[PDB]
Every structure is written in C-alpha cells, then in structure tokens.
C-alpha cells in the first residue's frame, strides 16, 4: 500500500482531535506520552508507553471442510499503561492484548469524576496480507488476552 495498515484517530469524543496511522511496516506500534512511542499522545494520565499495537500471523488449529484464515496476519492491541485502557467494552489492564477489528474504538483513558475522556478509532485502510483485515471472530466473542515475556521484550527496546 502506501505504508499504513491501521489508523488510530483520536476522535472528537476524546479530548484529542487528531489522527494516528500505524505503519504496517512498524511492529509493534507504540503509543503514549513519550515521543519514543510510534504514536504521540500527551495525556497527563497516559504513560511513556501507555499501550502498543502488535501484529501477528493469524492461524487456526485446523481447517476441516471450511477454509479458515489459513495463515495471514492480524493486529493485536497491547496495553502497558498502569491506568488501564478500555477496548469497546472489554477491560485492558497493564499487560493485556486484544484483537483490533476494522473500526476498533479503543479508550486509552476515561475518568468519570475528572471528565477525562479518551478514545481512538481504529481504521484499517491498507491490508498487508490480512485474512480479512480485522473482523475479530471466534469461539470467544471479543475477549481480552494477557501479555508475555515476548510482548514485554518488544517494549523493552522502546
């Protein structure tokens, strides 16, 4: 494509009215208040590496009769912030991972009393070999996963 696969755009609903574009070439894409993060969002509540998105090769266990994803790539949203982010309706605690479907609205920080409302809209513009792009569908209906040493290592270099 042009260089971007996913677009995270801090929508007007959030105190930030900007648009972020995750270059399919960059994996994983880091977001936070630190310029070091591929994504730049200055939020007093946010952390240097509040959260980062990581793309992985999607592959089911088996393909009997029906032809599943086969073996393409998907984008996972990783959260490393202590303020925990919110993905649509699923909780994102420090060290969690979640599937990012085309049009994924992720809340980086939300304060009921502070009125601090944040949220980015994920928009897959380019599909760099995506089984679909981002429909997030499986036995589990939108579930939050945990992070491991592999993920922690990605941010370690950050």
């Amino acid at each position: 494509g042009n260089g971007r696969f996913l677009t995270l755009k801090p929508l007007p609903d959030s105190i930030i009215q900007e648009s972020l574009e995750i270059q399919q070439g960059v994996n994983p894409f880091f977001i936070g208040r630190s310029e070091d993060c591929n994504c730049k969002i200055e939020d007093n509540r946010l952390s240097r590496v509040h959260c980062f998105i990581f793309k992985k090769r999607h592959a089911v266990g088996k393909s009997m009769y029906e032809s599943p994803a086969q073996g393409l790539d998907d984008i996972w949203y990783c959260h490393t912030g202590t303020n925990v982010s919110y993905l649509n309706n699923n909780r994102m605690i420090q060290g969690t991972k979640f599937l990012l479907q085309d049009g994924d609205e992720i809340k980086i920080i939300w304060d009921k009393n502070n009125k601090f409302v944040i949220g980015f809209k994920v928009e897959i513009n380019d599909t760099t070999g995506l089984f679909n792009e981002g429909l997030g569908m499986l036995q589990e209906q939108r579930v939050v996963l945990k992070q491991t040493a592999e993920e922690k290592d990605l941010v370690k270099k950050l």
Partner: peptide, 7 residues
C-alpha cells in the same frame, strides 16, 4: 515514582 490509576 510514577503512580497512575483511575477510579
């Protein structure tokens, strides 16, 4: 230190 949290 940096202590973040949201209730």
């Amino acid at each position: 230190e940096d202590i973040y949290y949201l209730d």
